C-alpha cells in the first residue's frame, strides 16, 4: 500500500511509498514518488516538486500565537511535467509500477538527501502553545507555476510531512565505565567512586541499571547518592546553543562510613508520562499533533561533526555523592563528588513496517 494526496483544487496528486526514510549514516534512503498531472487542466506548462528541511520555531517577543519563524536548512527541486533531459534517473521498483498503473499522465520524481543532515526532532510545546510543531521537520511539495519564483497558491499545490529517522546499530560498543578519585584537604586518603552500566545501547522503555561502587577512606561521611538521566541537546540554528534536561532521577538515602566500602545497583527508566510539564524537551519528530516518545540519540557520522544543523540529541547518566560539611571551611567549599556515564537510547530496526501513528486512536 502507498500513500497519496490531492490538491484542494483536485487537479494534481502526488504519491509516496512511505513516510519514514531511514538514515544509514553513510547514505540516506532515496525519496521517490509519482506525480499525477492533467495537461488539459494545466496550461502553466510546468509542474514542480520540492524537498525542504526547515527549522520552524515560535517567537518569544512576538505576542501573536500560531505565527512562527522559519529557516531553510536544505532545499531541492525537480522538473516533473515536461520530462527534463538533464534530470534523468533510473526508475525504482515501486515507481515504474505506479507509472504502469496510472498510465501516461503520471510522471516520476526522485531526490537524494545528502548525509550530515538533521533528523526529525520536535521540541515539546507547552500547554499554552497553539501553533504548529516546532523543531526540525521535512516536507515534500508539488506545485504548478510558469516559473520558480512565481507566487504560489495554496489551492494549486500539495504537501506531505516526511521523516528522516535512525535505528540502533547492529552491534553494541564497549561497556561504559567511569571513575573519579576525590582528595580532601584534611588527609592524604582519597574518596574513590566508580560506576558502570550493563551495556552501551538501550531501547525506549527498557530500564537502565546503574552499578555504583564507593571506597571511602577519608574522614567524611557520604550523606546521599543521587542518580539521574539527563538529555543533552545541541542546536546550531544560528549559533551553537546547549541545554541539559533531566528525564529521570532517583535519590537514595545511603551512607558510607569512613574506612568502609559500599556497593549497590540502581534502576531507572526514562519515560514521557512524568515529563509532560518540561517545556522544550526534545521528542521524536511528529507528522501531526500526535504523541511521540523521547527523542532518540543521533548517530554522528564518525569524526565529521561539522556542526550538524538542527538538533543533536544525546543522553548521559550522572552519579553524584553528597558529602558531609563542617570543619575548617564548613559551607564554603564544594565537597560533592560526581561522575557521568554516556549511553545510547534508540529503537531497534523494525522488522517489516515503519512506525504507526497512535495505533489505537482515542
Amino acid at each position: 500500500r502507498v500513500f497519496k494526496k490531492a490538491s484542494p483544487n483536485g487537479k494534481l496528486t502526488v504519491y509516496l511509498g512511505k513516510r519514514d526514510f531511514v538514515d544509514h549514516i553513510d547514505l540516506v534512503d532515496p525519496v521517490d514518488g509519482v506525480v499525477l498531472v492533467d495537461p488539459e487542466y494545466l496550461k502553466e506548462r510546468r509542474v514542480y516538486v520540492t524537498l525542504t528541511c526547515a527549522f520552524r520555531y515560535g517567537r518569544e517577543d512576538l505576542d501573536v500565537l500560531g505565527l512562527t519563524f522559519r529557516k531553510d536548512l536544505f532545499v531541492a527541486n525537480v522538473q516533473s511535467f515536461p520530462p527534463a533531459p538533464e534530470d534523468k534517473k533510473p526508475l525504482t521498483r515501486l515507481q515504474e509500477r505506479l507509472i504502469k498503473k496510472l498510465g501516461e499522465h503520471a510522471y516520476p520524481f526522485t531526490f537524494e538527501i545528502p548525509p550530515n543532515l538533521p533528523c526529525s526532532v520536535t521540541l515539546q510545546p507547552g500547554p499554552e502553545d497553539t501553533g504548529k510543531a516546532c523543531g526540525v521537520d521535512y516536507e515534500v511539495k508539488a506545485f504548478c507555476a510558469e516559473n520558480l519564483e512565481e507566487k504560489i497558491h495554496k489551492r494549486n499545490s500539495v504537501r506531505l510531512v516526511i521523516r528522516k529517522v535512525q535505528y540502533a546499530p547492529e552491534r553494541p560498543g564497549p561497556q561504559p565505565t567511569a571513575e573519579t578519585t576525590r582528595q580532601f584537604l584534611m588527609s592524604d586518603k582519597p574518596l574513590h567512586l566508580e560506576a558502570s552500566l550493563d551495556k552501551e545501547i538501550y531501547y525506549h522503555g527498557e530500564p537502565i541499571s546503574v552499578n555504583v561502587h564507593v571506597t571511602n577512606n577519608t574522614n567524611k561521611t557520604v550523606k546521599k547518592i543521587k542518580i539521574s538521566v539527563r538529555q543533552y541537546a545541541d542546536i546550531c540554528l544560528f549559533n551553537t546553543a546547549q541545554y541539559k534536561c533531566p528525564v529521570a532521577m532517583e535519590e537514595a538515602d545511603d551512607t558510607v562510613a569512613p574506612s568502609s566500602t559500599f556497593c549497590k545497583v540502581y534502576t531507572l527508566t526514562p519515560f514521557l508520562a512524568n515529563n509532560r510539564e518540561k517545556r522544550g524537551l526534545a521528542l521524536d519528530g511528529k507528522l501531526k499533533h500526535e504523541d511521540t516518545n523521547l527523542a532518540s540519540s543521533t548517530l554522528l557520522r564518525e569524526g565529521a561533526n561539522r556542526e550538524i544543523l538542527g538538533i543533536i540529541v544525546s543522553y548521559k547518566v550522572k552519579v553524584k555523592l553528597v558529602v558531609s560539611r563542617g570543619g575548617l571551611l564548613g559551607d564554603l567549599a564544594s565537597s560533592d563528588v560526581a561522575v557521568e556515564l554516556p549511553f545510547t537510547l534508540m529503537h531497534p530496526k523494525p522488522k517489516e513496517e515503519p512506525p504507526h501513528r497512535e495505533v489505537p486512536e482515542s
Partner: antibody, heavy 117, light 107 residues
Framework: VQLVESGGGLVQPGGSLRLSCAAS????????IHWVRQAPGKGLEWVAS????????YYADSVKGRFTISADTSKNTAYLQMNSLRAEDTAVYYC?????????????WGQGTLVTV | SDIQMTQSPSSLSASVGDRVTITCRAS??????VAWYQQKPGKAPKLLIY???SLYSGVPSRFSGSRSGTDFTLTISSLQPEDFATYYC?????????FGQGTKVEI
C-alpha cells in the same frame, strides 16, 4: 517470559474484586497491558487497557465508572479494580500484553481467571 | 468510533488437507490494522496474524492473511489435524478494540 494473573473467584452482585497480573520477562514501560474477558460460550471482549510510558488508561463503554486499572512498576504487576459487579460481568478474564513500540496485536496472554457473580 | 467486525461463516467443517478461507468484514475502513487469533477450547488465544498480512513469528507458513478493501481474509493452505480451533478477527485502529464473533473449524 510469561503472564500470570490471580484474584478471581465467586462474588455477590454489587461487590468488588481485585485482579492482579504478574508480568515476567518484560517491563510495563516497554509494553502495554490489556484485559480481555470472554463470557461463557461467547466471543472475546476488551474491557480495559493501560500504557505506562505515556500515562493513559482506556475502558470499554460497558465498564466505564465501575472498573479501574493501574500498574505498579516496582514489581511489574497490573491491577484491575472491579466495583459494583453487575450480574452480566461474569466471564473468564485474560491478561494480555502488546508492544508499546509499536502495537502489533496481543502476542502474550494470561492463563484465564474466572469471575462468577 | 466503534466498528463492528462482521465475521463469517459462524462455523464450518473441513477435512484434513483441505483449503479453508475465513472472511472478516469491517463496518468502516480500518486500514491494514487487523489481527488474527486462534483459540482452542479452554486455553488462551494464540496470535497468528498482525497487520492483516504479516505472519507472527513461529507460526507455520500454511497460515496466510489477505486484504481487499475492508474485507480481510484468513486462508490455510493445508489444514493440519491440529488446526481445528476457533478463530477471532480483531481491528486495532480505534478504541474500543472490537473482535469478530468468531468462527469454528471442525472435522
Amino acid at each position: 517470559v510469561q503472564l500470570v494473573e490471580s484474584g478471581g473467584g465467586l462474588v455477590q452482585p454489587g461487590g468488588s474484586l481485585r485482579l492482579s497480573c504478574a508480568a515476567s520477562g518484560f517491563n510495563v514501560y516497554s509494553s502495554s497491558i490489556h484485559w480481555v474477558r470472554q463470557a461463557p460460550g461467547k466471543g472475546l471482549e476488551w474491557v480495559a487497557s493501560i500504557s505506562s510510558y505515556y500515562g493513559y488508561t482506556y475502558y470499554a463503554d460497558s465498564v466505564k465508572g465501575r472498573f479501574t486499572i493501574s500498574a505498579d512498576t516496582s514489581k511489574n504487576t497490573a491491577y484491575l479494580q472491579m466495583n459494583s459487579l453487575r450480574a452480566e460481568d461474569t466471564a473468564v478474564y485474560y491478561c494480555a500484553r502488546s508492544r508499546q513500540f509499536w502495537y502489533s496485536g496481543l502476542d502474550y496472554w494470561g492463563q484465564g481467571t474466572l469471575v462468577t457473580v | 468510533s466503534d466498528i463492528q467486525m462482521t465475521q463469517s461463516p459462524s462455523s464450518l467443517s473441513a477435512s484434513v488437507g483441505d483449503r479453508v478461507t475465513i472472511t472478516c468484514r469491517a463496518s468502516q475502513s480500518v486500514s491494514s490494522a487487523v489481527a488474527w487469533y486462534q483459540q482452542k477450547p479452554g486455553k488462551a488465544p494464540k496470535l497468528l496474524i498482525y497487520s492483516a498480512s504479516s505472519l507472527y513469528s513461529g507460526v507455520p507458513s500454511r497460515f496466510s492473511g489477505s486484504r481487499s478493501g475492508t474485507d480481510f481474509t484468513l486462508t490455510i493452505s493445508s489444514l493440519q489435524p491440529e488446526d481445528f480451533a476457533t478463530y477471532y478477527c480483531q481491528q486495532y485502529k480505534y478504541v474500543p478494540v472490537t473482535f469478530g464473533q468468531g468462527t469454528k473449524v471442525e472435522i
